[PDB]
Amino acid sequence: SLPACPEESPLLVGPMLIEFNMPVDLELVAKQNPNVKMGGRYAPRDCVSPHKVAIIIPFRNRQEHLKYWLYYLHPVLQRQQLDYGIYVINQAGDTIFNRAKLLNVGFQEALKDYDYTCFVFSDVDLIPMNDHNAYRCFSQPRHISVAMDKFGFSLPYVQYFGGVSALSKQQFLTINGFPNNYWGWGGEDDDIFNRLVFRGMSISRPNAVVGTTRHIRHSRDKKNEPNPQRFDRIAHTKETMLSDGLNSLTYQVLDVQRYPLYTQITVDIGTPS
Ligand SMILES: CC(=O)N[C@H]1[C@H](OC[C@H]2O[C@H](OCc3ccccc3)[C@H](NC(C)=O)[C@@H](O)[C@@H]2O)O[C@H](CO)[C@@H](O)[C@@H]1O
Ligand SMILES: O=c1ccn([C@@H]2O[C@H](COP(=O)(O)OP(=O)(O)O)[C@@H](O)[C@H]2O)c(=O)[nH]1
Ligand SMILES: [Mn+2]
């Protein structure tokens, strides 16, 4: 009996002021977000969203960025009228970071909670500056963080697909998900670009003004040195995607914690094989 939410949300206020120089108390954020239900789940009370979105954050040792992420995104995602949940996929151990493998774990695990049909993949340190930048899926894969301050508020190259993106359930399945063997920094987002292009798709984007995005400045994380194999790996995507991704994935979930504003899945994703 509730009617469809309108196509575009009437609640959006467009551009927003974004800053990362004050402390954040998630207790307060939770109290400022009374409609967000345990585990960081929200759907509107007044209408049915067609956007059933699981937002997936690859994570290790960035608690400070996460509280900023939570503080800014939760109110925006509510104004966008999404039926959404947050998933922080926390890499166990202290071995080399694997961004794309976490994202896969995220897709697969989230699906167990709820019938999500859209996946937003978001780095922890990127915050949109305009709530017209929709954190849901389109008829083609969606690149969301299109004009980041750190790249001068434009794309750093036209095939860039890093930062924040969104794939529908079907688009993610169609590329066999993300690669598992990009260990350490660099290039997994280029490989994913390739995967989309090899399956007949193109990149949807908002304009540079709406897609304005802030990156929280930070120094290097240890255990994520540039991957020196990344260039050879991206040159073979077409062949390797056939058997490397969802259909070749295993992991062991160590812990699932429902916090009021996000579900955190701690996971053993292993070391290179
Ligand atoms: C492969 C990689 O390291 N990608 C990074 C990227 O690195 C800087 C790099 O970006 C462009 O090249 C991407 C690329 C894609 C396929 C094969 C080889 C390289 C850029 N190319 C152009 C035409 O402008 C090149 O000049 C640069 O050195 O940086 C981004 C943002 O930090 C990461 O998201 C990628 O993973
Ligand atoms: O030790 C790490 C390495 C990276 N990441 C996650 O992976 C993303 C991408 O890595 P990074 O911030 O280094 O990209 P950069 O800003 O250096 O280009 C981060 O936003 C986090 O979501 C993390 O949580 N812990
Ligand atoms: Mn970063």
- DSSP sequence for 201-214: ---B---TTTTEEE
The finding on whether 214 has its CB within 6 A of some atom of ligand 2 is: no
CB 214 within 8 A of CB 175: no
Question: Rounded CA gap, 100 and 96, in Å?
Answer: 12
- Give percent helix, percent strand, percent coil of the chain, each to the nearest 5: 25, 25, 50
CB 236 within 8 A of CB 181: no
User: For ligand 1, what atom is nearest to the CA of residue 162?
Assistant: 34
Conformation bin of residue 29: beta by default, left when phi > 0, alpha when psi is -120 to 50: alpha
User: For ligand 2, what atom is nearest to the CA of residue 124?
Assistant: 22
Question: Rounded CA gap, 93 and 271, in Å?
Answer: 10
Question: Rounded CA gap, 18 and 183, in Å?
Answer: 32
Strand pairing class (212-215; 126-128): antiparallel
Strand pairing class (126-128; 83-91): unpaired
Please state which of the four CATH numbers 3.40.190.10, 3.90.550.10, 3.40.640.10, 3.30.390.50 is assigned to the domain occupying 1-273.
3.90.550.10
Q: How far is the CA of 144 from the centre of ligand 2 (A)?
A: 17
Close Cβ partners of 262 (under 8 Å, ≥ 6 residues apart): 39, 40, 66, 70, 86, 87, 88
Q: Which approach determined this entry?
A: X-ray
The finding on whether 117 has its CB within 6 A of some atom of ligand 2 is: no
User: For ligand 1, what atom is nearest to the CA of residue 156?
Assistant: 24
Q: How far is the CA of 20 from the centre of ligand 1 (A)?
A: 27
Question: Rounded CA gap, 204 and 201, in Å?
Answer: 9
The ligand that comes nearest to the alpha carbon of residue 63 is: 2
Strand pairing class (118-122; 52-59): parallel
Question: Rounded CA gap, 25 and 211, in Å?
Answer: 27
Question: Rounded CA gap, 83 and 54, in Å?
Answer: 9
Q: Which residues pair with 123 in a beta bridge?
A: none
The ligand that comes nearest to the alpha carbon of residue 264 is: 2
The ligand that comes nearest to the alpha carbon of residue 183 is: 2
Over the range 77-110, which residues count as b (16 or more CB within 10 Å of their CB) and which as e?
A: bbebbbbbbbbbbbbbeeebbbbbbbbbbbbebb
φ, ψ (nearest 5 deg) of residue 203: -90, 120
- 113 assigned to a ligand binding site: no
Closest CA to 138 of 165, 111, 161: 165
Domain ranges of the chain: 1-273
Mutate which of 62, 144, 230 for ligand 2 pocket (most atoms within 8 A of beta carbon): 62
Close Cβ partners of 155 (under 8 Å, ≥ 6 residues apart): 146, 147, 208
Closest CA to 81 of 122, 136, 39: 136
Chain breaks in the chain (C to N over 2.5 A) after: none
φ, ψ (nearest 5 deg) of residue 14: 70, -130
Amino acid (1-letter code) at residue 32: Q
- 191 assigned to a ligand binding site: no
H or E element at residue 26? helix 26-32
